[PDB]
Amino acid sequence: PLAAGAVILRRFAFNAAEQLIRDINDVASQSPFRQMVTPGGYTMSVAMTNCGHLGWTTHRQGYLYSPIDPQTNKPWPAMPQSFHNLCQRAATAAGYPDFQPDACLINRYAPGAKLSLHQDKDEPDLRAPIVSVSLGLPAIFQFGGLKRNDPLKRLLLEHGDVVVWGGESRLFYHGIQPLKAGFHPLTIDCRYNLTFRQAGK
Ligand SMILES: O=C(O)c1cc(O)c2c(c1)C(=O)c1cccc(O)c1C2=O
Numbered sequence: 001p002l003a004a005g006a007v008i009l010r011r012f013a014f015n016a017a018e019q020l021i022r023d024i025n026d027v028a029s030q031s032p033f034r035q036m037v038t039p040g041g042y043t044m045s046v047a048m049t050n051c052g053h054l055g056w057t058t059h060r061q062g063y064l065y066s067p068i069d070p071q072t073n074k075p076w077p078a079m080p081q082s083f084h085n086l087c088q089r090a091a092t093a094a095g096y097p098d099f100q101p102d103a104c105l106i107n108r109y110a111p112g113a114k115l116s117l118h119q120d121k122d123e124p125d126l127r128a129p130i131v132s133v134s135l136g137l138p139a140i141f142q143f144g145g146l147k148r149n150d151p152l153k154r155l156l157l158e159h160g161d162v163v164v165w166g167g168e169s170r171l172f173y174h175g176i177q178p179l180k181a182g183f184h185p186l187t188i189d190c191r192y193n194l195t196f197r198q199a200g201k
């Protein structure tokens with residue numbers, strides 16, 4: 001395997017993509033995309049929003065999952081059907097039939113935007129996989145191992161690609177390299193990524 005515990009499903013979301021993007025726009029109409037500030041004080045180049053019961057966000061100089069969007073003071077929008085159903089099909093195919101995400105982080109990349117190498121290890125149950133769905137322009141995804149200094153590997157993620165990151169891979173350090181400019185007929189000039197998480201207890 002390229003990554004222990006990971007299941008790559010290329011073009012799995014290709015047919016669903018137009019609906020998924022419509023639903024991204026619907027979510028963003030309620031909880032807008034925003035570029036969050038890191039604890040180090042830097043404005044992220046990736047713009048974000050969330051849907052589901054919980055949303056990943058900065059709050060009081062840390063990160064956490066919150067039921068309320070701090071920008072609107074309202075709940076994050078409910079998980080769209082298209083999101084829920086796509087995630088469940090992917091997770092089930094990959095051997096995680098009980099995966100029940102309560103958070104979906106929606107990342108938007110303009111040309112040049114990047115995501116610095118990091119782990120997601122603050123979720124209560126690290127046995128639950130993350131399901132990652134790529135839409136629009138292609139991006140180079142980098143991933144290493146459980147330690148920051150483990151060797152990095154790189155994989156192009158293209159429109160409609162889904163990866164279910166389970167087992168050990170769930171805790172790999174990962175990031176996205178600066179997005180190359182281009183054109184995609186459904187997203188125009190950007191990439192979106194959905195990451196479904198079980199963030200609740
Ligand atoms: O493409 C993106 O914007 C994007 C951003 C993320 O933060 C993650 C991913 C993609 C993953 O695919 C992923 C893989 C394995 C474990 C994880 O925690 C993550 C994520 O957190």
Ligand SMILES: [Mn+2]
Pocket residue numbers: 118119120
């Ligand atoms: Mn992450």
